[PDB]
Amino acid sequence: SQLPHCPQSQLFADLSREELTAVMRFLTQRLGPGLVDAAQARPSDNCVFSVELQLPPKAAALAHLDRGSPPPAREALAIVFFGRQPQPNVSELVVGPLPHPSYMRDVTVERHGGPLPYHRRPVLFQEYLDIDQMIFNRELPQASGLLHHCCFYKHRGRNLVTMTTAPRGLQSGDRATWFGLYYNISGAGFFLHHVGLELLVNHKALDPARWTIQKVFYQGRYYDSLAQLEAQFEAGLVNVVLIPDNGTGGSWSLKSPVPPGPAPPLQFYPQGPRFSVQGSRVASSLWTFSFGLGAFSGPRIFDVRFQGERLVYEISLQEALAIYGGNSPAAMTTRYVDGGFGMGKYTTPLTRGVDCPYLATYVDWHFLLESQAPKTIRDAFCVFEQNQGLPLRRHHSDLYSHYFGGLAETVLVVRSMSTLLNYDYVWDTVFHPSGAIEIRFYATGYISSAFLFGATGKYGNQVSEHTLGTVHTHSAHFKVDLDVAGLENWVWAEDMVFVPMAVPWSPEHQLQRLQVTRKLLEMEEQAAFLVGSATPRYLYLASNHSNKWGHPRGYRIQMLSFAGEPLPQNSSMARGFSWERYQLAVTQRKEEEPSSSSVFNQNDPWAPTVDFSDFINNETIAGKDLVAWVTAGFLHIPHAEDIPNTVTVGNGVGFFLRPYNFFDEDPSFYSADSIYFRGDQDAGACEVNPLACLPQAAACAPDLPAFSHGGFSHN
Amino acid sequence: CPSVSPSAQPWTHPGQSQLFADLSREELTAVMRFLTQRLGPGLVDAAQARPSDNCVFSVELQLPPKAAALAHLDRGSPPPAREALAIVFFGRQPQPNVSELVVGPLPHPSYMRDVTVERHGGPLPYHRRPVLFQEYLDIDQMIFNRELPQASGLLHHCCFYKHRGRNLVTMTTAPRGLQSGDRATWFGLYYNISGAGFFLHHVGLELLVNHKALDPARWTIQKVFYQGRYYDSLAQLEAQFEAGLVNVVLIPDNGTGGSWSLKSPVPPGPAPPLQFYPQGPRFSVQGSRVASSLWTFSFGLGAFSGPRIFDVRFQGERLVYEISLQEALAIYGGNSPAAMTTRYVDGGFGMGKYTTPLTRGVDCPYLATYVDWHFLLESQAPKTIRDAFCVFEQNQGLPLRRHHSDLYSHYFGGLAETVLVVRSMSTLLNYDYVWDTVFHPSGAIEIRFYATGYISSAFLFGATGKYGNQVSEHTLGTVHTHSAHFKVDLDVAGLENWVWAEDMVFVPMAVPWSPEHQLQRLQVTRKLLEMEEQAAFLVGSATPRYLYLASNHSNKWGHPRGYRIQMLSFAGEPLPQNSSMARGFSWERYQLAVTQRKEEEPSSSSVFNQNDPWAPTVDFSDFINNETIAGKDLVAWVTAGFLHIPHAEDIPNTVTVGNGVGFFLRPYNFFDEDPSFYSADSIYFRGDQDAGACEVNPLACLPQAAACAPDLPAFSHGGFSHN
Numbered sequence A: 001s002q003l004p005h006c007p008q009s010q011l012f013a014d015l016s017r018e019e020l021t022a023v024m025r026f027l028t029q030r031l032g033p034g035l036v037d038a039a040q041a042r043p044s045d046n047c048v049f050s051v052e053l054q055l056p057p058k059a060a061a062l063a064h065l066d067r068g069s070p071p072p073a074r075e076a077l078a079i080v081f082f083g084r085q086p087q088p089n090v091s092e093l094v095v096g097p098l099p100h101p102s103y104m105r106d107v108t109v110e111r112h113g114g115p116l117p118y119h120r121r122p123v124l125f126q127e128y129l130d131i132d133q134m135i136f137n138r139e140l141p142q143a144s145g146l147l148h149h150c151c152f153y154k155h156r157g158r159n160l161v162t163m164t165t166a167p168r169g170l171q172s173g174d175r176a177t178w179f180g181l182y183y184n185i186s187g188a189g190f191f192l193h194h195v196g197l198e199l200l201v202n203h204k205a206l207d208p209a210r211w212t213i214q215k216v217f218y219q220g221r222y223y224d225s226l227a228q229l230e231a232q233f234e235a236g237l238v239n240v241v242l243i244p245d246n247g248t249g250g251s252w253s254l255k256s257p258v259p260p261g262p263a264p265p266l267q268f269y270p271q272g273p274r275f276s277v278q279g280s281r282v283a284s285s286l287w288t289f290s291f292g293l294g295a296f297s298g299p300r301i302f303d304v305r306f307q308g309e310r311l312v313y314e315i316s317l318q319e320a321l322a323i324y325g326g327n328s329p330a331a332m333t334t335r336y337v338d339g340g341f342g343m344g345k346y347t348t349p350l351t352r353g354v355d356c357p358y359l360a361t362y363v364d365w366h367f368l369l370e371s372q373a374p375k376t377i378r379d380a381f382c383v384f385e386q387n388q389g390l391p392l393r394r395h396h397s398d399l400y401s402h403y404f405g406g407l408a409e410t411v412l413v414v415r416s417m418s419t420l421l422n423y424d425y426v427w428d429t430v431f432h433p434s435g436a437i438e439i440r441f442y443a444t445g446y447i448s449s450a451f452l453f454g455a456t457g458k459y460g461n462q463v464s465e466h467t468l469g470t471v472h473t474h475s476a477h478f479k480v481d482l483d484v485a486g487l488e489n490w491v492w493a494e495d496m497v498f499v500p501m502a503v504p505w506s507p508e509h510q511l512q513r514l515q516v517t518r519k520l521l522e523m524e525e526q527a528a529f530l531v532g533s534a535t536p537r538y539l540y541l542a543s544n545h546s547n548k549w550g551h552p553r554g555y556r557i558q559m560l561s562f563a564g565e566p567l568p569q570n571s572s573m574a575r576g577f578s579w580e581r582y583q584l585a586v587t588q589r590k591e592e593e594p595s596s597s598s599v600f601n602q603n604d605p606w607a608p609t610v611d612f613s614d615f616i617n618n619e620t621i622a623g624k625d626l627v628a629w630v631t632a633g634f635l636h637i638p639h640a641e642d643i644p645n646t647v648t649v650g651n652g653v654g655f656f657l658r659p660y661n662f663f664d665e666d667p668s669f670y671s672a673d674s675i676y677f678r679g680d681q682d683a684g685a686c687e688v689n690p691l692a693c694l695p696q697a698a699a700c701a702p703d704l705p706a707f708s709h710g711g712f713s714h715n
Numbered sequence B: 001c002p003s004v005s006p007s008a009q010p011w012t013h014p015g016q017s018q019l020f021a022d023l024s025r026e027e028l029t030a031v032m033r034f035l036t037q038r039l040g041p042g043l044v045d046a047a048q049a050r051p052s053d054n055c056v057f058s059v060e061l062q063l064p065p066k067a068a069a070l071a072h073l074d075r076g077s078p079p080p081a082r083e084a085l086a087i088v089f090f091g092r093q094p095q096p097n098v099s100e101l102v103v104g105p106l107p108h109p110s111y112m113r114d115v116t117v118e119r120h121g122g123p124l125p126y127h128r129r130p131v132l133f134q135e136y137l138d139i140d141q142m143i144f145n146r147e148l149p150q151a152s153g154l155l156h157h158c159c160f161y162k163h164r165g166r167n168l169v170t171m172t173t174a175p176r177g178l179q180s181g182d183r184a185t186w187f188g189l190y191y192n193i194s195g196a197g198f199f200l201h202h203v204g205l206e207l208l209v210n211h212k213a214l215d216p217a218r219w220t221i222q223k224v225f226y227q228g229r230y231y232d233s234l235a236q237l238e239a240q241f242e243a244g245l246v247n248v249v250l251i252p253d254n255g256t257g258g259s260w261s262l263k264s265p266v267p268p269g270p271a272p273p274l275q276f277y278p279q280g281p282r283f284s285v286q287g288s289r290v291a292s293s294l295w296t297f298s299f300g301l302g303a304f305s306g307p308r309i310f311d312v313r314f315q316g317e318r319l320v321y322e323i324s325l326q327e328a329l330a331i332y333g334g335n336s337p338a339a340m341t342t343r344y345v346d347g348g349f350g351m352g353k354y355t356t357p358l359t360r361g362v363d364c365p366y367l368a369t370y371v372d373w374h375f376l377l378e379s380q381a382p383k384t385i386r387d388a389f390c391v392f393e394q395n396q397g398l399p400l401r402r403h404h405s406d407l408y409s410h411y412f413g414g415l416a417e418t419v420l421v422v423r424s425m426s427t428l429l430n431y432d433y434v435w436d437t438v439f440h441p442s443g444a445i446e447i448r449f450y451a452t453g454y455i456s457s458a459f460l461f462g463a464t465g466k467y468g469n470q471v472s473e474h475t476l477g478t479v480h481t482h483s484a485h486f487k488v489d490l491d492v493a494g495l496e497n498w499v500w501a502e503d504m505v506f507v508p509m510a511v512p513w514s515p516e517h518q519l520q521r522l523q524v525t526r527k528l529l530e531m532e533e534q535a536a537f538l539v540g541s542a543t544p545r546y547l548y549l550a551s552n553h554s555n556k557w558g559h560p561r562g563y564r565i566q567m568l569s570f571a572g573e574p575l576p577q578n579s580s581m582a583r584g585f586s587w588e589r590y591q592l593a594v595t596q597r598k599e600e601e602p603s604s605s606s607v608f609n610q611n612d613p614w615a616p617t618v619d620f621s622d623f624i625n626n627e628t629i630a631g632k633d634l635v636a637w638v639t640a641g642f643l644h645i646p647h648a649e650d651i652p653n654t655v656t657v658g659n660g661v662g663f664f665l666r667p668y669n670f671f672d673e674d675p676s677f678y679s680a681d682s683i684y685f686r687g688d689q690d691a692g693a694c695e696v697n698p699l700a701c702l703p704q705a706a707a708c709a710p711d712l713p714a715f716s717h718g719g720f721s722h723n
């Protein structure tokens, strides 16, 4: 013996390197020279900010996928900043038959009913650099006496770093950004090392020369300017607290002081993998779908088919939201609308063996954002099968007949991860062998901290020396366009109630008769459930047709959410993310309603570009193309166990999509992996029980490839 | 490659005793010998016993008092007396009762004490006794010999009644009557399907058997339900049948599909994923102790209460003295008498007593560690459930923590989550409960149960879905609720604990640097829960999103060291209080409750509540009164459950997907930092370093170390029995 080694269209695929190049060429040509690389651009420059796939209309996409009609025009969307103009109108531009582009159309006025104001533009990478020039050259030296005393200020400024805040002002049009100052920690999170200084930078002016500092916050007190502070410091009435710059422990490191022990468990596929990834399609025994990333909206999946039948046209991440409170101006006013940064744009490489199982299939992402040449995130997606170590179904019979019949649960996962400043979002889409789909998101990585000062926990817990863990809420929104056995769908709500009754065979007694309550949700407003409201324990979208037993074929939404209290309606800001107020909502699917948020809401939520609440508009949902909008989130009070990073344990939040009288029986009855044997049969007979042959088939060493990491440069 | 353990399991310090281990084969025998001797002959084997017999029903471990167990485990004092509890049916008596008997220093027993009056303040009425196995058989003798032939004219037309032999089977129901003292049991009749679930094949006939009488001869049938109508007797029916005015619907005798089979018609494809430990396992099971790098605990099964875990220590420090399953509950509704009155208090049967063997590769990962359970229940010799427990490490394929830094400094730091699982499975008639306890490397503990197996069905007749969905031909999937109760005795950094509730609120404010504007100031609300009543959260009430039990002392950062209860529950509407029955499972009405831990309050339920819930033996709500929970030995009672409306996807069995329900126990300012920073398995590397250098990144050496065929043993299965 010498034991051996172990072994449909691309219509939703993200744009390829060539396709991105072809649109940029087309753009530089037909948009008139005078065009700046977005990495270099200034406010008054003309700029291509983003180029990514423009999703096709549903009717044409379906006509192709089902009826066999020709494909709709594959198109791209480009976001262009028009700065070299007296009145800038930032513009949305559709481009070309995209294999060989040939036209261009401005849809800004079409979609948003008017020009997009220039102040809504996301803060460019160059703009961030210009801001640091002002802070470190023009501004911080004015307080170098203070900074020398507190913060180890070196005459060449880079022992400090800045981190952005959130809605840039108090009012539509504003562009004033608080910036915290942190020690530039090497090889670990700086987010835990706030030096106690925040600066309110006004960078609305098209000329960076005219940018000013409106306010200064230092270790618990406000000031008018860095001079106004520095004066009071040298006057002896600004008492510093030394924030150390270096130490040992989790506050300072991610490297463990403990050497590796015996290896942890490892999965492998003893008879080869049981799925394939061809570009943007994944195909398996049971499942079929196309996947991808929106540059700003994030992970998304299309044309999902269980055993050949479409369940859902589109499941896409729509927006993520982090609302903070604190004792300092940065924390108590931060409301991150992360789509304004980009969940796809900030997708980080997946570390083989940590982020996914070692033997997962890792896939690269190509993008064109804030530059002129397209780039790649290596290992942006991972796709893998996971043995849950759990049975999908089971029965063990000792009664009247001796038999066992079960099936271990093995799932198919698709995963992306977005690192947005301090934290890391994980985006799970899990496909179950019962026909159910699962959407779970996780929040890990570093917390956001502030300098600790006279406060009684109204704003968080002390996690380390001089460091306040600022309270905040996470919440995300998902577009779920179910097409349950066709387009036309209805929304059902079923639930329970007890009814007192005389016992039929003894009316002198009283029982409580358990019954099912069922209601058809006719209007959009009946399917809009606010956060905090009582919710039907069974809510499902169903077809007009029936299964074998006469029940409408539906799937059901089941939510795992600990949703936090939403930002009040009184706040002018709330309209920019009014989807937070809901747990779940079903609206008519409409081409002119493709998303619940916009990349332009982050910088101007008071005059929102997209306001989700407008979609809920008093229509019928009885027999239309429906789409479910699910909000999942939770409240996070940071604590000491949250200082290496946030652990994922218990913080996974999301929802299930489960068949409810959609089939005539559970399809895992037909499973090729279901185990069954009688008590009079031989359970060790490989003939009878495939598990008995597992030692023979799994008697091989894996061929697990050499460790690669997708790298990261300095973008 | 390795075959057993690698580098000698763990090296920690001492303090490993099996004071909580279930009784061994020897220990059970010694008590039975002791009982037959000193309890006076006239004693019958429980498997053979009749109502009027004298009977040993159960013998199992009697848990020690906390104070003596702790003094031994910590202070070093001698162990408390290892004892056992025996349930004895006293039938050969003018006034028959059931009695609870403690017995002996249990290595070599020497005494006996009746604690029935001590614990329950009086004798245990005999009608509360669980229905014996022999009692079920006697009922079937009555039904099949004395009773069913009286309607064989009907039965030959509808149901393939063969001569006298059984092709039909009965299934019990739940609270046996309408009133304290009753013992009248509905029995459904089903085709005795071979090799698959009979529960999906209700023939449409239910019989109300009165078996309260100590003499089986005096047992009678009070009522008969057939295909939508009631009758007085099987003769009264059989009359109207031959009279031509009882219209039968043929229920078929046989078929194909999930309605009829569990065997797939599809042959095996390529093997599914498999885990293994490339450098040996990283944990050990010595009897009832489990020990790993991080975790240490003793596990077991109560015969009626079910799975339980004791003396849990993360990195050598106790977090919890006891986490035990307490009771499981299934409340049904239906169009027939059986369904619409069924309220199973499964502890009255036994979650441990009905623990089934774990099939290697389906119920747990193939390479899990399977452990046997010894018991003495309804017999005179102890038996064994082979592979009753499984213990294993599971790579979650999920990171525990992660950061990928592209900003100001190029680094990655993370750790893939690997968990430690302990699992039992209880098959109670139609359904299969899975009992998970998952130990996380963050210091968190997780309790998840699952419900799978066959649904209970009834014969379908004129009904508009008020009681369920039609799942197959002539089969109604009856609506019901699952719910279970957990005793969680946390001792957070000592016995004395307080209960904290933290939650959130927004406060309008003028903007400090622009008072012309308004902000909404996010703040934290915090309240100390002082009285037991403040910590009793009813189902449907609003719950603090942060609720935790904490010590008097503080972590490095001055915060009280606590753990936190986080619940994943979709709990169903509870049985109303207006019902006289509800007192037998009043724990259902709460989501979570914290009470003073007391020796005389060891359990929220009783095996004797199933047959007499109107006069409950244990009434949970009595635990909640006007006592302080500010600085005592506390104990949390967590309820988790959901509503189940059966549907077509539930006809091979119930899938576990999404039906997992339970709660988390997570550290909240208990440590000075997340202990997984110190993980031996944490990955970290800078951008200027070599990620492929094994020196730098242990993952790079994984292909070298995982170049190994496993040594996965030959498949065993734990067999079955005729009980």
Ligand SMILES: *[C@@H]1O[C@H](CO)[C@@H](O[C@@H]2O[C@H](CO)[C@@H](O[C@H]3O[C@H](CO[C@H]4O[C@H](CO)[C@@H](O)[C@H](O)[C@@H]4O)[C@@H](O)[C@H](O[C@H]4O[C@H](CO)[C@@H](O)[C@H](O)[C@@H]4O)[C@@H]3O)[C@H](O)[C@H]2NC(C)=O)[C@H](O)[C@H]1NC(C)=O
Residues within 6 Å of the ligand: A158, A161, A184, A185, A186, A713, A714, B408, B409, B688
């Ligand atoms: C916060 O503090 C940190 C230290 O405490 C600072 O970290 C330092 O950042 C600099 C700037 O990024 C790093 O640059 C130096 O090292 C790199 C490494 O080069 C190697 O790896 C590259 C992959 O990124 C390859 O592309 C290279 O070919 C090489 O294999 C050098 O690339 C740097 O550039 C040098 O050479 C170029 C070209 O000739 C010159 O233009 C530069 O002037 C320079 O001479 C640097 O040598 C540095 O590694 C890093 N230090 C540590 C210890 O990690 C950090 O800069 C600071 N804050 C900010 C805002 O950056």
Ligand SMILES: *[C@@H]1O[C@H](CO)[C@@H](O[C@@H]2O[C@H](CO)[C@@H](O[C@H]3O[C@H](CO[C@H]4O[C@H](CO[C@H]5O[C@H](CO)[C@@H](O)[C@H](O)[C@@H]5O)[C@@H](O)[C@H](O)[C@@H]4O)[C@@H](O)[C@H](O)[C@@H]3O)[C@H](O)[C@H]2NC(C)=O)[C@H](O)[C@H]1NC(C)=O
Residues within 6 Å of the ligand: A030, A031, A032, A082, A085, A089, A091, A106, A109, A115
């Ligand atoms: C928001 O702002 C954007 C730009 O910031 C606006 O887009 C501009 O729209 C203007 C009209 O609203 C348009 O202005 C005039 O010019 C175009 C013609 O220019 C286009 O076509 C030429 C081709 O024509 C000949 O001449 C050119 C030299 O100009 C030669 O190179 C060429 O070879 C050919 O012989 C293109 O070359 C050129 O690049 C333009 O695409 C007219 O059609 C208009 O009617 C109008 O008179 C201006 O060109 C647009 N800017 C562009 C395309 O960069 C947008 O309108 C605005 N929207 C709102 C609501 O304010």
Ligand SMILES: *[C@@H]1O[C@H](CO[C@@H]2O[C@@H](C)[C@@H](O)[C@@H](O)[C@@H]2O)[C@@H](O[C@@H]2O[C@H](CO)[C@@H](O[C@H]3O[C@H](CO[C@H]4O[C@H](CO)[C@@H](O)[C@H](O)[C@@H]4O)[C@@H](O)[C@H](O)[C@@H]3O)[C@H](O)[C@H]2NC(C)=O)[C@H](O)[C@H]1NC(C)=O
Residues within 6 Å of the ligand: A488, A544, A545, A622, A623
């Ligand atoms: C289930 O829903 C589908 C989809 O339609 C949607 O749901 C229904 C319930 C409504 O809410 C609609 O508003 C939604 O769009 C239904 O599909 C339709 O089914 C029809 C019957 O099978 C079919 O037409 C048939 O009859 C045609 C004759 O027209 C009749 O009506 C006119 C008056 O309008 C009457 O004068 C005339 O005498 C006829 O009786 C005939 O031409 C067709 O060949 C066919 O036989 C529709 O074509 C079809 N819809 C489409 C778009 O094709 C389905 O009926 C629903 N089933 C139910 C409710 O059981």
Ligand SMILES: *[C@@H]1O[C@H](CO[C@@H]2O[C@@H](C)[C@@H](O)[C@@H](O)[C@@H]2O)[C@@H](O[C@@H]2O[C@H](CO)[C@@H](O[C@H]3O[C@H](CO[C@H]4O[C@H](CO)[C@@H](O)[C@H](O)[C@@H]4O)[C@@H](O)[C@H](O)[C@@H]3O)[C@H](O)[C@H]2NC(C)=O)[C@H](O)[C@H]1NC(C)=O
Residues within 6 Å of the ligand: B496, B552, B553, B631
């Ligand atoms: C944290 O809590 C523990 C547990 O006690 C519980 O919580 C405290 C806060 C109270 O609410 C108790 O009612 C709860 O049961 C505390 O443990 C206790 O700590 C004491 C201080 O070390 C210790 O007693 C010490 O002092 C004794 C002298 O008695 C003094 O008080 C009387 C007035 O009553 C006075 O006349 C006398 O002159 C003394 O000044 C001494 O005899 C002891 O030997 C010992 O040195 C208690 O024994 C102990 N509790 C128990 C049950 O043993 C702990 O202090 C708290 N820590 C904090 C608040 O930081």
Ligand SMILES: *[C@@H]1O[C@H](CO)[C@@H](O[C@@H]2O[C@H](CO)[C@@H](O[C@H]3O[C@H](CO[C@H]4O[C@H](CO)[C@@H](O)[C@H](O)[C@@H]4O)[C@@H](O)[C@H](O)[C@@H]3O)[C@H](O)[C@H]2NC(C)=O)[C@H](O)[C@H]1NC(C)=O
Residues within 6 Å of the ligand: A400, A401, A402, A680, B166, B169, B192, B193, B194, B195, B722
């Ligand atoms: C409901 O129907 C069930 C089947 O339809 C009945 O199950 C049967 O129950 C009997 C009694 O418990 C059980 O024992 C019988 O078969 C044994 C095994 O068969 C022998 O022969 C085979 C070869 O054919 C050989 O491989 C075996 O090793 C074994 O030697 C006999 O050993 C035994 O003596 C007895 O005859 C049956 O196995 C079982 N049949 C099935 C198909 O499960 C059940 O009894 C009935 N319910 C009630 C309440 O009656």
Ligand SMILES: *[C@@H]1O[C@H](CO)[C@@H](O)[C@H](O[C@@H]2O[C@H](CO)[C@@H](O)[C@H](O)[C@H]2NC(C)=O)[C@H]1NC(C)=O
Residues within 6 Å of the ligand: A568, A570, B506, B507, B508
């Ligand atoms: C939100 O807007 C509602 C509008 O009806 C307003 O009532 C709330 O303002 C005030 O809240 C106070 C409690 O925090 C209350 O004492 C006061 O009466 C109430 N104002 C009025 C006119 O009744 C607004 N709440 C918030 C949080 O902004």
Ligand SMILES: *[C@@H]1O[C@H](CO)[C@@H](O[C@@H]2O[C@H](CO)[C@@H](O)[C@H](O)[C@H]2NC(C)=O)[C@H](O)[C@H]1NC(C)=O
Residues within 6 Å of the ligand: A186, A246, A247, A248
């Ligand atoms: C942060 O501080 C540690 C010590 O706390 C530094 O370790 C020092 O390293 C230098 C050179 O590498 C030695 O000369 C010192 O003797 C070390 N000190 C101790 C106490 O071990 C570490 O270098 C510091 N971090 C950085 C980035 O310089």
Ligand SMILES: *[C@@H]1O[C@H](CO[C@@H]2O[C@@H](C)[C@@H](O)[C@@H](O)[C@@H]2O)[C@@H](O)[C@H](O)[C@H]1NC(C)=O
Residues within 6 Å of the ligand: B194, B254, B255
């Ligand atoms: C169940 O029946 C299967 C096929 O028999 C079918 O049923 C009878 C009533 C007739 O309608 C006949 O024409 C059909 O073919 C068998 O293959 C199977 O063995 C039967 N199951 C048993 C006997 O347990």
Ligand SMILES: *[C@@H]1O[C@H](CO)[C@@H](O)[C@H](O)[C@H]1NC(C)=O
Residues within 6 Å of the ligand: A498, A500, B576, B578
């Ligand atoms: C219980 O009885 C009271 C009688 O006062 C009644 O008001 C209440 O509605 C009843 N509850 C239920 C669930 O029937």
Ligand SMILES: *[C@@H]1O[C@H](CO)[C@@H](O)[C@H](O)[C@H]1NC(C)=O
Residues within 6 Å of the ligand: B531, B533, B626
């Ligand atoms: C004490 O218990 C009674 C019920 O007997 C209750 O009404 C009262 O509110 C309780 N008081 C306190 C302080 O717990």
Ligand SMILES: [Ca+2]
Residues within 6 Å of the ligand: A524, A587, A588, A614, A615, A616, A617, A619
């Ligand atoms: Ca709408």
Ligand SMILES: [Ca+2]
Residues within 6 Å of the ligand: A481, A482, A483, A484, A487, A489, A589, A624, A625, A626, A627
């Ligand atoms: Ca739809």
Ligand SMILES: [Ca+2]
Residues within 6 Å of the ligand: B532, B595, B596, B623, B624, B625, B627
């Ligand atoms: Ca109490």
Ligand SMILES: [Ca+2]
Residues within 6 Å of the ligand: B489, B490, B491, B492, B495, B497, B597, B632, B633, B634, B635
């Ligand atoms: Ca306690």
Ligand SMILES: [Cu+2]
Residues within 6 Å of the ligand: A443, A472, A474, A636, A646
């Ligand atoms: Cu968070």
Ligand SMILES: [Cu+2]
Residues within 6 Å of the ligand: B451, B480, B482, B644, B654
């Ligand atoms: Cu159920």
